[PDB]
DNA sequence: CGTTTTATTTTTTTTTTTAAA
């Protein structure tokens with residue numbers, strides 16, 4: 089009904105009259121800048137958004153089908169060359185075909201792209217470009233996709249054009265050529281990859297958020313086919329939001345399994361959005377301790393545990409001597425059953441700590457948290473399909489009540505104590521998998537709540553092999569204190585009468601600001617001046633004497649010294665001064681001492 | 690200026706440029722660049738001693754020496770490399786006579802080893818017919834599968850026992866074979882002919898640069914007729930090769946074809 | 962200048978895995 093032509097005039101006016109002076113800084117040509125970026129042979133994809141055309145008019149806020157507009161604008165600016173020879177493979181290869189002498193898509197050279205979920209996705213959504221957020225599933229890989237090949241006749245010579253949109257196809261035969269027409273001189277048909285056009289191609293399933301799905305519902309997935317430039321633009325288990333099109337899928341073939349008008353739909357892509365800049369404001373603030381003041385406000389007091397965590401948040405200790413690496417990840421252990429809200433801090437960290445994970449005391453047996461295997465006589469063979477502990481690299485996978493899972497379960501996790509090494513002689517390998525995950529252990533005491541008669545490993549039943557792999561072991565008990573629980577109570581009830589706990593003692597730090605300030609930290613690689621080396625080796629001995637002077641005491645591993653070394657240089661990442669010094673390790677030992685000497689007194 | 694219609698490459702340029710390079714050759718590492726190194730003759734002439742005197746055929750040789758020489762050779766070798774490499778073999782098969790004209794010049798050579806990669810995880814449309822080399826750890830130990838090259842015919846009357854090899858897939862049919870009087874109709878049989886060997890085993894990339902919580906992604910390719918069980922399988926090894934692609938038979942009812950193309954790599958060489 | 966196209970299900974033995982007073 090509407091004209092698909094006079095709109096071409098409208099958009100010519102739009103892009104031509106485009107230096108839109110709404111602010112100091114727009115009299116220059118915006119899409120002229122992008123135009124010349126095409127003339128730079130650089131940009132192969134431009135972009136449309138609601139604001140852009142919204143100011144222009146109000147038709148096309150509901151006209152744009154999303155399909156005809158694209159081919160029209162593409163051909164429109166393809167024939168727009170207001171503007172150098174050897175820039176591309178194919179681009180110069182046409183000149184090679186012209187050295188002795190098309191649709192503008194075959195010289196593609198560029199592209200353009202432009203508050204609901206699958207559940208709400210009402211089935212009158214065809215063609216409309218809509219918005220949904222999900223979770224990625226079943227990570228796959230990318231291959232080339234033809235669009236239009238060049239089936240030359242050789243004897244005749246006529247590089248045939250087979251521009252295709254389908255996903256299945258059929259060959260082109262000997263010759264639809266002019267000289268290979270009724271004029272008897274002809275050869276045969278045969279493509280030339282070099283002059284052919286293909287396109288990247290990434291696909292993966294999309295599962296539901298799991299926060300919307302009603303009481304009587306089961307999450308389901310859709311399919312994602314993103315081709316061309318945008319490939320490799322999301323990993324598995326990223327909570328991502330996509331604007332694209334719903335489009336049906338003409339699954340042609342058999343004439344009785346189809347022929348229902350089957351309509352097994354699918355989706356077309358534009359983008360994978362997943363829900364220094366700070367430097368001037370980072371200049372506004374210079375403090376070390378306020379992180380604890382604004383990280384996890386939900387409980388008053390017990391800062392020491394939190395700062396112990398924030399160190400693991402800090403990081404920044406690693407070296408590769410002798411060819412071999414060193415574990416630069418901290419792994420805390422946790423015993424206790426008070427009301428701590430380990431579940432609290434776990435949820436807090438797992439939210440703010442990007443690339444987080446969670447498992448429970450029996451939810452993942454030894455094969456699930458790591459890679460595993462499967463069985464099916466319908467899809468082919470089976471793979472490892474690693475688990476949370478496999479996936480949580482550059483981060484932490486947080487087990488809750490590792491004490492209660494199982495004794496043999498300590499094995500495979502103990503294997504990852506020596507980091508980045510997940511050996512598997514199961515699928516005919518000694519595979520590695522790079523287990524590069526910081527580890528969070530939290531459990532409860534044994535029968536009772538730290539019965540003072542039943543001593544350590546008298547009350548506990550854990551082999552030394554795992555405690556040795558753990559930098560810090562922490563028992564948490566707070567006996568009846570008349571004054572203690574008061575403050576904690578009124579503190580809790582504050583966000584019950586209210587929504588935001590801590591007033592007027594610090595500036596709260598949002599997830600964004602917190603993460604960004606932490607983002608500026610770890611790349612210092614600071615200086616530990618040489619006097620420490622003689623000094624610290626002395627101080628370590630101070631431990632090893634008061635370890636031996638009582639005979640019913642803890643054993644020690646070389647990691648005790650390696651740990652007390654490992655922690656200090658990390659914290660200088662958040663000092664941001666490349667200056668590992670006395671305080672850098674005096675806090676290390678201080679917190680180590682606080683880890684102990686707490687259960688007798 | 691004599692060239693494929695769709696390209697910019699020619700035999701004579703690369704041939705002459707490389708023959709001058711090997712004449713610009715004393716071991717340019719150990720006699721021109723690493724003059725502090727030393728084995729002082731063009732090594733390939735030295736090898737035509739130490740190959741012929743060795744009588745020990747199927748040389749192995751790189752081409753990273755060529756960075757000093759004209760790099761246009763490097764490029765057009767990088768991009769058009771199944772159509773220049775035999776030309777560099779032809780230059781060698783000419784070099785035979787520099788050092789021994791009247792040899793038993795009946796054998797050929799085998800053969801790169803110069804260009805880079807980072808990883809297999811992500812490649813591109815650009816990277817389609819180009820030189821690559823990547824490494825990992827091997828998984829399997831395959832069997833052999835040969836491949837045909839020619840038709841050996843038969844006859845009915847007076848023994849029109851014709852023959853002819855293949856371009857890659859066709860033989861023509863007028864009413865007889867190489868139409869010789871057509872005493873009978875066309876003939877063919879497919880055994881007394883040329884066949885060619887290969888296998889297939891895949892590799893698992895295993896560097897220290899493996900992305901976070903990521904799985905194995907793995908690659909694979911055949912062999913050629915000398916590159917066949919060089920291999921006590923399963924260890925840390927590099928390959929060179931040429932990224933290859935192939936369309937796919939859609940469905941299987943009939944000749945429909947797929948949109949998506951499968952890929953593997955051409956089959957050349959290994960490293961220890 | 963005419964006359965024709967197209968579907969498969971249950972059980973084994975191995976290697977995985979899993980159960981009760």
Ligand SMILES: Nc1ncnc2c1ncn2[C@@H]1O[C@H](COP(=O)(O)OP(=O)(O)OP(=O)(O)O)[C@@H](O)[C@H]1O
Pocket residue numbers: 386387388424425426427428429430431432532576580
């Ligand atoms: N001082 C406090 N600060 C914040 N929250 C508190 C405090 N005291 C009690 N609470 C609340 O009391 C609840 C206690 O149950 P909780 O989730 O702590 O079990 P838990 O202590 O994690 O159990 P276990 O330690 O046995 O695993 C917590 O959710 C926490 O929110």
